[PDB]
Amino acid sequence: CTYQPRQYIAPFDRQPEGRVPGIPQYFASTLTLGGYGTGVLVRSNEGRPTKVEGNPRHPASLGGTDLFAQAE
Amino acid sequence: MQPEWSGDPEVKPVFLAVTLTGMVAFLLMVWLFAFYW
Amino acid sequence: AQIFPRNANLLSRLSIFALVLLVVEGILILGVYFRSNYFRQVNVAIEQPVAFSHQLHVNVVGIDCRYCHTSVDQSYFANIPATETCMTCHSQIKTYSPLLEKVRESYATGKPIEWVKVYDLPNFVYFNHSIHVNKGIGCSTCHGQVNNMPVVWQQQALYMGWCLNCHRNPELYVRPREEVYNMDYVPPSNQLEIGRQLVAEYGIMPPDQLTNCYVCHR
Ligand code: HEC
Ligand code: HEC
Ligand code: HEC
Ligand code: HEC
Ligand code: HEC
């Protein structure tokens, strides 16, 4: 018996240009509740969205976010 | 009151054997748990 | 004498002695098994799908570590090379070779090459190469002579005690940067004095902080 399974690792075939592996990035996008857009900054762990935050430069979303934007 | 075994050739030898066993066990345990890594 | 033979005395005493010896032996076997190299997969050269040899590329061809593991000094993850980096040499060198077929199978289809992870942590440890390397530690006192490793093996089992030994006494392992420089670096005889000076200079925190739980586990 052994401490753990083989745990194979799969890398890329062509590296994304602006990405450093293991470093999350943040992208600016808009989420609408009543059809009115609210600016959001969303963390992309490895090209997948994982955490929505607020956009400090967006009017009506200065850092703060509503629950509906968080639970998207 | 004397021990039942008092006056026996085997008393010192058995005590010695028990002590040697104990020391060996102790050293081996110590090695495995402290120095083997 | 009523129901027992004469040698029953010796048999009973020897049975007690053997029972104690057997208990001690069982404890010893359990400890050794749980601290064995087979259990923790140490010094076992794990066979890889493409048979990559660090000895050839590093010691003979002479390629820097950061050419392949490009993210080692900037993030917690040492970037495993993409097939792009493999093909920048083998598009011309050793082309039409049966042992580079899998590589050539990639870079034409998007399928990756499934390497087997040698150094594996149980996903509650949260290691970071960046701070370590930047603080004067290299992959020789931390990994082994990978420069001369045809097949990479685990040099030591990554025990909690192993990490805590050096987190507590970092003056016996800290080096004057040049940690990515070829690991031909040998520690000097006066390692203690240089290590203390480097600990003072780099500002490595005392064991009061480096042994906290949320340093590793989260
Ligand atoms: C703060 C006092 C703690 C506590 C309570 C624990 N650790 Fe650690 N830990 C580290 C590493 C590398 C491992 C893996 C060990 C291995 O793979 O053999 C662990 C593991 C543990 C365990 C074992 C969990 C299990 O289910 O087996 C436990 C109970 C544990 N830790 C408790 C690394 C570190 C640290 C590096 C700096 C330090 C600090 C801590 N651990 C601190 C703690
Ligand atoms: C400079 C001497 C180094 C050091 C210290 C390491 N590498 Fe590499 N490495 C490369 C590839 C394709 C792999 C995976 C294939 C395999 O593991 O055989 C590795 C692997 C490692 C490991 C182990 C990975 C693990 O999961 O534990 C380690 C510790 C490691 N390397 C350290 C690619 C290259 C490469 C060519 C692009 C070169 C040059 C290096 N590595 C150099 C080094
Ligand atoms: C990307 C991580 C890889 C992989 C998987 C391999 N290489 Fe190289 N490689 C280079 C040179 C100069 C040689 C030797 C040339 C010769 O033997 O004539 C090799 C050899 C290999 C082999 C062995 C092939 C064989 O023995 O026939 C293998 C399996 C291999 N490489 C895998 C040069 C580079 C290089 C710099 C130009 C880089 C980058 C790589 N190789 C990357 C990889
Ligand atoms: C000696 C070669 C070490 C080994 C073995 C391990 N670590 Fe380490 N670690 C080392 C140094 C010199 C430092 C710098 C300390 C500082 O304050 O600058 C560290 C630091 C870390 C950290 C970050 C500490 C922090 O405050 O955030 C982490 C998360 C860390 N080390 C993790 C870690 C683990 C999980 C290890 C076992 C696999 C481990 N280190 C071993 C030196 C050494
Ligand atoms: C401290 C000891 C170090 C140092 C200074 C380096 N490595 Fe790294 N390495 C180490 C551990 C404990 C692990 C396991 C990580 C895990 O999540 O289980 C690794 C892992 C690697 C890997 C595998 C890919 C990855 O985990 O990101 C590679 C590749 C690797 N280490 C290479 C590497 C290089 C190039 C270093 C610079 C000299 C280096 N390690 C330093 C422990 C440590």
Write the DSSP assignment of chain C as a string of letters.
--SS-TTHHHHHHHHHHHHHHHHHHHHHHHHHHHT-HHHHT-S-----SS---HHIIIIIS---HHHHSTTTTTSSS-PPPPHHHHHHHHTTTT-S-GGGHHHHHBTTBS----EEPSS---SSS---HHHHHHTT--TTSSS--GGG-SS---SS---HHHHHHHHH-GGGT---S--SS-TT----TTHHHHHHHHHHHHTPPPHHHHT-HHHH--
Rg of chain C over Cα atoms, rounded to whole angstroms, equals 25
Residue of C204, C173, C169 lying closest to C188 (CA atoms): C173
Chains touching chain A through at least 3 C-beta pairs below 8 angstroms are C
Angle, nearest 10°, between helix axes C8-34 and B11-30?
10
CA distance B33 to chain C (A): 8
Residue of C49, C107, C156, C129 lying closest to A6 (CA atoms): C49
Asked whether at least 3 C-beta pairs link A and B within 8 Å, the reply is no
DSSP β-bridge partners for residue A51: A43
Q: Give the separation between CA A17 and CA A21, rounded to whole angstroms.
A: 11
Is the CB of residue A26 less than 8 Å from the CB of residue A20? Answer: no
Is the CB of residue C116 less than 8 Å from the CB of residue C96? Answer: no
CA distance A12 to chain C (A): 5
Instruction: Name the residue facing A13 among C77, C106, C122 (closest C-beta).
Output: C106
Distance (angstroms) between ligand 2 centre and the Cα of C54 equals: 7
What DSSP element (H or E) covers A38?
Answer: strand A37-44
Query: Which amino acids bring their CB within 6 angstroms of ligand 5?
Result: C 65, 69, 72, 77-78, 80, 119-121, 127, 129, 132-133, 137-139, 142-143, 158, 179-180
CB contact under 8 A, C83 and A14: yes
Token couple for C13: 């005493």
**Reported structure resolution in angstroms:** 3.3
Q: Give the separation between CA C127 and CA C130, rounded to whole angstroms.
A: 9
From which experimental method does this structure derive?
Answer: cryo-EM
Choose the mutation target among A13, A19, A23, A46 for the interface with C, i.e. most C CBs under 10 Å.
A13
